[PDB]
Subunit: 370 residues, 4 copies
């Protein structure tokens, strides 16, 4: 077994937007839901923590919290006026900070804590306190721009954590693998002209931001070649992702030689997620974690941090998150995923798999990875 | 104009299974949800009715209920021992009538009413009481086999309605277009060797029942050529469905000359549904309804019945159902679908569209379907 | 059977405040609920409508909607600046209009419709279109002051309806019986110096507004004697209310000779309500309705309007509301209240009943009604 | 200081009955709730744990779980056929184990764990591992009879824990103070003819079981004088409970000289609970806990165990439970109860307080209770 730190704070589960039906603000033609609320709900993360507890896996992890992100840490990425505007709206009982960026009362303090967990997770792994770590950072981060909240993200959690780590530890090469089903536009933008951070996003082609594919966006100037977008066809599942990992991600990491790998781990590529159209099961997430852990072992002395991002199935995210944490820790709990065999039967047929495989081969060639 | 009957009963919204997380029975490693419950929830149909009300659509429809299905009607399809078993379990507070077929307390009476609405909707249209009809039949029907509940369906609503219509009116040719995103396996099985019902299912390849495609299953013996499965690739959206409609569905209806068209209208092909991976928006459903209404006007004297089946997005199903009912009635409300433009941007790219289009062309050829143009 | 109009609009069920746990705004130490939300929820009224439908009673009523209250109607009670402030907050996605007065997006238009239903219900009965009427006016009205939202009420529904009726029909004597479990402070204040409206409130002593009893507040000057508060001891049930009706309410109505009776019908005196401590069952509400209908028949030519106010038990309000509507219409549905016999067993004992009875006798004497 | 053990297991929050509206089984005229479900919901205990966490209280406690109750432990109270019946129903997806005793899938294992936490909490305190303990035992226990589940209780948690403690430690005198707002009928029945357990219940007169008061039920034969019921008038609040504590509970404990005090701590006497009509606030619970902790310090070497029972306000139970745990541990968090001042203003008036006070004075006399002052 490996020593896995689990960064968690109950307060992160207390962030909540005003009334929404899925992602639609209530009002106009949108009736208030009788129960549900915004897709980015506490239950889509709480149920992961609950399952970690009931499985007993929590007892085999190093459980940690952290202080909230300081102004100094936040200001490496975000302007003081952004902090001010966010705080003011949060103090006024919430509202809209951006397009698809709704906040609630006290969301400002809670978002600082989310960012703080990510900072602390990178710190712990670079300090040798754990071999690897998982940070349950809610609200999520990977769509957030320096001065623009987006896609349910209010601070750029991973970028804040990276800039803090560079300041404190002087790490030179960080890879960020973003397997949240949506494009990691925040991470991409921040590091677009940088060669010290390799940003890779696997995402459903055109999902969010809507209509964005991005294969041709490989970074610029000093960063040219240090950003890779893999826009997978909607409907893809396990094979599409395994092919992307083998043909693009692993070769890209091999060439870059990261000293630390950070995963933007959304689970919204799962087969029952409302916010995308991909077909992953819990063993897909297990396999991706195994592959990136192996890459971390080969290049980064094992130094791997997984940061929770998206995932909107209350029923199924917990099984997917559990699989990741089992793989990080090398511990196998008694949990059996009850949907795995069902999802295996729903996968793309051979003709569709081949179609997607050929596109990935072409993309690997475009990237110079063949 | 057009006179659209809306068969609805509030009691259909009172059916509810025991605790589930989406489709997973609670227990073992599945934690009870704090609110949600089984995916087939009352709210996924109630919000449609609410939106019909606030938009002013309900006021422009012929709002009707019906008596529940009689034992006679149900026994045309289901055995007495099935009825007995269902009733006993329903009287005992519910439970599992099969894999993915959970019921709750009183679900037997409510399922009889759901079937009754479908029977009545077909009756009304064949009787000339309305030009067309929509039946909010919950619980749904299209997966139910004669002696096996399946896929949240407990009676074979559409088949029960058809067999009742044949007994009462003597209709000879009925087409059932099933655009619920899952395979209409109940309808297929019941009519598999029959030429008096053309069953067509558009579905996500391999979704539910899991791993079933079915393109080669075209019916047998007397029914050979009277069943068509169109297994669309996961991830497809508007174009995939329009192409399926134009290349397969419309030619198949033209050849069959239905006297009545029934739609098994699930909305779970919508772009945010948890139970499938397709990318339809409300205008996709509107366009499919326009096409089938036109087919009904040409062959069947306008006789078209749409029967609610699946659809699991509480937020988005209402907009999709509203679009269908607007198209049936010829009434356009002030409702603007707030996700339409967003979903448009998420559609498959040209390479993926072409790939799916070529498969549909091959499938139309495999079916021996001639690309005729609509005519009277 | 009588001709009963049922004023209802689906849009009234679409009003919804921001996140609350019961009556507590989310934030600080108050965790967002996983489902529930504000106590004044759509479900506490929707379930009444649903049960009316499933029972078939809806088919035996005269179903009506109405246009929203005009500015002219609203401005008889409320200032233009109140309307403006309410609209602005509603257009900004909601917030707090007052103490225990939270609104949501579009609540302004919905509150106008609620008030419009009440206006229309009084109009219909005074016009002879129905013998009596029930108005499902959500959000409720009876705590609202002219320039101060309070207690989940944003317009003074009943007062707006009365002033509209006086302008259109010239009715001279209206009685308002408020059996919502909380004090009808809005109605009381507006008509406190008026003898053309007799305001009676039955309420739990000190419940809401908190600590208010009010027996000594009988109106002033021209209105002296035309306001009656009956502060019932917490814990009382059927007998306490029957005694209040017989010893105070009926004699008060007999003396006043109303030409129209309006009931502010909250159901929050029911035995499982979270927002009060009283023990009514559905036959209590049936009996109160029978008594006030009889009073309306004796004095007002049958002219009775019941306006929905409070009631916070999703499970039990529907049975209580159904009983009222059965009594108004003279139709008895097949519905059997499944909690009635249970609640009958929980009632105050003889010593407690006698204690409360003696207090009501003393209060009847104070009011000059002995 | 003070070392407080907090017996908690996440799995206790996974017990869930089939659909109910508050306490009403869904079916017939009872519509399924859109969210809520049975009043005995996980959220009414989860929000306590969450608040303990965010307030920093959990970090200052000894957080412990325990193994589930063994068959041996359960069979001290319950028959094997009861265990068998419960397990069978739990394995079949749940249902009704009696009137107001609904279970769900896996509830058997979870109820065993709830009982196990109570057993372990008594063990820990008798073993000197902690000064006192709180056990979040869900599902609750105090209504359960040996062969009859009742009032949302499926095993007699406190009685099972006591009989296990007697077997393991040989404790001779245990007092059970039950301030859950409903009558502790299970505890009363089991120990009704026993002098080794003093059972005291404060409850709303006639609430649950419905119409039961019970002041004249003081135990029989060997147990005569070792059961006390205090049926408080509906509508009572802080003063009623303080008066009951001072005039009845403390004198009764003084005479009994318990070696261990167990509290059946329901929070359903809180001022916003749907399942009773009483008016307690968080400081009422704090004050009761201070009084019983002091009694435990004087008689029992500090040995006090609080076992969670009822409490049905999701919003308000957390503040009440937090106050109890603060008092057990001697730790005061930064939490300020946001309803405390409001509830203070709603309290019975002086006439009503005097009326209830006089009844308690009469009841203390009827019980032959001497008003002694606390001493060591
Ligand atoms: K991504
Ligand atoms: K880069
Ligand atoms: K289909
Ligand atoms: K066929
Ligand atoms: K009142
Ligand atoms: K007056
Ligand atoms: K008690
Ligand atoms: K005893
Ligand atoms: Zn995402
Ligand atoms: Zn379906
Ligand atoms: Zn009220
Ligand atoms: Zn209780």
């Amino acid at each position: 077994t490996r020593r896995t730190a689990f960064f968690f704070d109950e307060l992160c589960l207390w962030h909540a937007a005003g009334p929404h039906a899925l992602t639609l603000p209530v009002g106009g033609w949108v009736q208030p839901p009788a129960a549900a609320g915004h897709a980015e709900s506490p239950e889509t993360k709480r149920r992961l923590k609950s399952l970690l507890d009931v499985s007993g896996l929590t007892a085999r992890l190093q459980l940690r919290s952290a202080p909230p992100a300081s102004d100094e840490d936040l200001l490496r990425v975000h302007p003081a006026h952004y902090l001010e505007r966010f705080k003011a709206l949060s103090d006024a009982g919430g509202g809209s900070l951006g397009q698809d960026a709704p906040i609630g009362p006290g969301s400002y303090e809670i978002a600082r804590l989310s960012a703080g967990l990510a900072i602390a997770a990178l710190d712990a792994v670079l300090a040798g306190e754990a071999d690897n770590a998982y940070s349950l950072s809610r609200p999520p981060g990977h769509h957030c721009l320096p001065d623009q909240a987006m896609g349910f993200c209010f601070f750029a959690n991973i970028a804040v954590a990276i800039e803090a780590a560079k300041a404190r530890h002087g790490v030179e090469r960080v890879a960020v693998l973003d397997w949240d089903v949506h494009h990691g536009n925040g991470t991409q933008a921040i590091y677009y002209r940088r060669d010290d951070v390799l940003s890779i996003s696997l995402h459903q082609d055109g999902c969010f931001p809507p209509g964005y594919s991005g294969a041709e966006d490989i970074g610029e100037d000093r960063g040219r070649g240090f950003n890779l977008n893999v826009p997978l066809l909607p409907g893809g599942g396990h094979d599409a992702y395994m092919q992307a990992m083998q043909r693009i991600v692993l070769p890209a990491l091999e060439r870059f030689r990261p000293q630390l790998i950070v995963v933007a781990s959304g689970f919204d590529a799962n087969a029952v997620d409302p916010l995308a159209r991909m077909q992953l099961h819990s063993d897909s997430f297990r396999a991706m974690t195994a592959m990136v852990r192996d890459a971390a072992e080969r290049h980064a002395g094992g130094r791997l941090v997984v940061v929770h991002e998206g995932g909107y199935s209350e029923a199924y995210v917990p099984f997917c998150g559990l699989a990741v944490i089992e793989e990080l820790s090398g511990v196998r709990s008694a949990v059996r995923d009850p949907l795995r065999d069902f999802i295996e039967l729903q996968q793309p047929n051979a003709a569709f798999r081949d179609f997607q495989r050929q596109r990935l081969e072409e993309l690997a060639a475009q990237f110079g990875l063949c």
